[PDB]
Subunit: 502 residues, 2 copies
């Protein structure tokens, strides 16, 4: 129940607490309380703490308060727990099941049994799935001993929107998207104004009255085409000319969709505008985000995209809308959603086909069944097995075979234990070498997956030497599952890592 | 501990089944005759056994042999193991690691410590992922004691293709696709020749190589004309609405068939099957979409096969290199039987257990089997993890609809949250009525390629009283995607189970 490897005693133990606007100064005078888990919460990661700092009344678009650093004097036990069920924690630690867990954690008896000589216990738990951070749960009375220093006050930076918070969080990564949103906001304002002033003012050719969506989109695609000839949008024209996600039809679909959901009541409030915008599809077209990459990653190109998007919303509002919004609250709100998504891409994350993250392609979904399946262990003679889940979204799509790694004399496919099972039907495979480093295995009867029909590909590896695999030796870091043929096959990739035994 | 005692037992006259290739069905009944896993293999499921009975030289389309039942006299110990790693088995069972596991299994010394008084031990392992069958591994020497009875001989039935094998397997399910393929072959043959008698739109055909785009357009024209014929009238009706079954998909199928079939291929049923089996689009001809086999009558299946037969006939000139009525029909029938058999087998549907729900670009799933179970019969808390991502551009998650039971099952609003690439987002939860709470993220959630989320649902039970079926409307948690006014609905199906 206790993770010894995450538990330790520390002198001057410190941690971080996100603070709401209006408490950044008040909190520095001392931690005071305003069932089992009632307590003061903090984290070891100051950038995660900053995510708790935003106005409660306006959480999508409101002001961020700050981050403070709290320190205990003397010695503190960090007791790390392997479960977050208080009922289970109390039984397995054999203490009163009546009293709330965090009240007991502050009692002198508890601190004697678990403090290893420290003055107080702090509980430690995983911060979140996908995060290596921890959260700390402090007992409120013990929390009176904390000293509280300012780490950062975002309100004091005096920046627009939530820029201060997001610029701070971007420090965590030093591919990092680290954009100066002051510049972007200024360039955007400049570009909208300059674009509003020749061929553009295509406007006169506008129906300017509630028309049909299909006619509105036809017109907005023409407007988009004309708008992109302007020199202030020349780079955007170049970087948006090939990828179909960034095409005029998607700018137009976006603007139409925006105009259809923004009524007077929504346009008049930034929070309600952000909420409405945040549930629309297609924002990737304006952000330049496709295929796992943030392509618009310079202040200039972002401002260009936002400006063009602003103009187009302005043109779509007469054609489909109710209803100024386009250049004011729409720009503020969209900027917020950029920062959200950029932040997601900045954060460490496993990519498709790594660990248990699905690889989605051509209608298929494939994943390693468990994290350990994605690890090819090394340093021993013998056998391992690895399960790959496979299915598809709708109609029956075939699985032609699998490309597997081999290392001459050290890593081989075990041809009798490698197989694929379709809704439990076990299908044997015929494996043939392509070259010294790649074997191709084909199922001995046809495999189809689809809605309601899944497969388990079981790959078995044999090692003849106990010599560890070295980087040089391996060319691919993926197992390539082949789907239907189009002459090319649909390639479904499962990425593995070579590790020694633990 | 490697031995699962809940799956181990001693039995008198222990019996199991063995799939037998053509040519060995009679020979094998005279007796079972011959590193770690070397042994004689069988299964408790005769339908799974039947899947090992196809000609090893023509596994895709070859003839199926049979199934035999093998029985040990006296008492047999079935020793079920929780791992299939022989090196790990020998260590936890303290055995010679220089000696193969299945050799050790057949010795008096092994049979003493693990046999429980039985004359021999048979090893038992899970048959396959997604199956509740077991495979048995028999020591070759011990196996000489087996008597062998015929369960079924597929060649004796004297049917075409692998009809006998698949008709046997369909007995497993008594929805069940249990089609008479002799009828379908007969009806198919008669419709093809009846349609060759306005169809003969064949005159407008280039009759020489052209471009795909022209070929496809002419085949869409041929398909429309073909469908007016009275012998295909039920097909016209049932394919008129679902876009998977549209004429343009029949045309794309036929073109793709003509491009991969050369003369070597057309003249050999095995090679035709291998080539056809890697093409996309076959659901159009099969009438399979959205998790259902729609074409599930002998008449409608024959109409569909007849029509694509004619269309392949018309497409070979326009892009190609008699096949259409011969090996094409024999091959496509076999692929039909494969897929029908998959849909007949017990299987969790999308969003059940750890099967992903794929919809509108999103992919969502329960993180583990236990997450998909809401336990009942206690006061207290549980948590449940749902994985969420999407295939390409950023797509939003608006919220989640959660079940509630007034005064007995409640959302723990403090512990329910969502985390995006590790960023923890708190949720604002408000009841819609007394049975449904809606939770929305306090900061915007987007998923996409390289951005995923973990939705953590926390439930509080106020009562020790077990939930009763009546009390719960839904059987799913509804995760809401982007707005189109409705939201994209992503469903995660749960089961209520007692603690245990």
């Amino acid at each position: 129940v206790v993770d010894s490897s995450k538990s330790f005693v520390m002198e001057n133990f410190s941690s971080y607490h996100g603070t709401k606007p209006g408490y950044v100064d008040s909190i520095q005078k001392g931690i005071q309380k305003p069932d089992d888990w009632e307590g003061f919460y903090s984290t070891d990661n100051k950038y995660d703490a900053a995510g708790y700092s935003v106005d409660n009344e306006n959480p999508l678009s409101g002001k961020a308060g700050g981050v403070v650093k709290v320190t205990y004097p003397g010695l503190t036990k960090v007791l790390a727990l392997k479960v977050d069920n208080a009922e289970t924690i109390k039984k397995e630690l054999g203490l009163s099941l009546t009293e709330p867990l965090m009240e007991q954690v502050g009692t002198e008896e508890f601190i004697k049994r678990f403090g290893d000589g420290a003055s107080r216990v702090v509980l430690s738990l995983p911060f979140a799935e996908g995060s290596s951070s921890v959260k700390y749960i402090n007992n409120w009375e013990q929390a009176k001993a904390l000293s509280v220093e300012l780490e950062i006050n975002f309100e004091t930076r005096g920046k627009r929107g939530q820029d201060a918070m997001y610029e701070y969080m971007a420090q965590a990564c030093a591919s990092c998207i680290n954009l100066d949103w002051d510049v972007i906001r200024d360039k955007t304002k400049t570009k909208i104004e300059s674009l509003k002033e020749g061929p553009i003012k295509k406007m006169s050719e506008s129906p300017n009255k509630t028309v049909s969506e299909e006619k509105a989109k036809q017109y907005l695609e023409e407007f988009h085409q004309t708008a992109l000839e302007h020199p202030e949008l020349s780079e955007l024209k170049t970087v948006t000319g090939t990828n179909p996600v960034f095409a005029g039809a998607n700018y137009a679909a976006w603007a139409v969709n925006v105009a259809q959901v923004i009524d007077s009541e929504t346009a008049d409030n930034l929070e309600k505008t952000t909420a409405a915008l945040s549930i629309l599809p297609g924002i990737g077209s304006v952000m330049g985000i496709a295929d796992g990459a943030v392509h618009h990653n310079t202040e200039e190109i972002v401002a260009q995209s936002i400006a063009l998007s602003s103009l187009m919303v302005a043109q779509a509002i007469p054609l489909v809308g109710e209803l100024g919004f386009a250049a004011y609250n729409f720009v503020e709100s969209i900027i917020n959603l950029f920062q959200v998504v950029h932040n997601s891409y900045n954060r460490p994350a496993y990519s498709p086909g790594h660990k248990t993250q699905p690889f989605l392609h051509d209608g298929y979904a494939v994943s390693w069944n468990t994290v350990e399946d994605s690890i090819i262990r090394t340093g021993f003679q013998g056998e391992s097995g690895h399960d790959i889940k496979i299915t598809a979204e709708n109609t029956p799509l075939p699985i032609a075979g699998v490309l597997l790694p081999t290392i001459p004399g050290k890593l081989d496919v075990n041809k009798s234990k490698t197989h694929i099972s379709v809704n439990g039907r076990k299908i044997r495979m015929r494996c043939r070498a392509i070259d010294g480093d790649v074997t191709f295995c084909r199922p001995k009867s046809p495999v189809y997956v689809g809605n309601g029909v899944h497969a388990n590909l079981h790959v078995a590896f044999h090692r003849s030497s106990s010599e560890k695999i070295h980087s040089n030796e391996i060319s691919s870091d993926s197992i390539g599952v082949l789907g239907y043929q189009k002459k090319v096959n649909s390639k479904l990739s499962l990425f593995f890592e070579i590790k020694s035994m633990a």
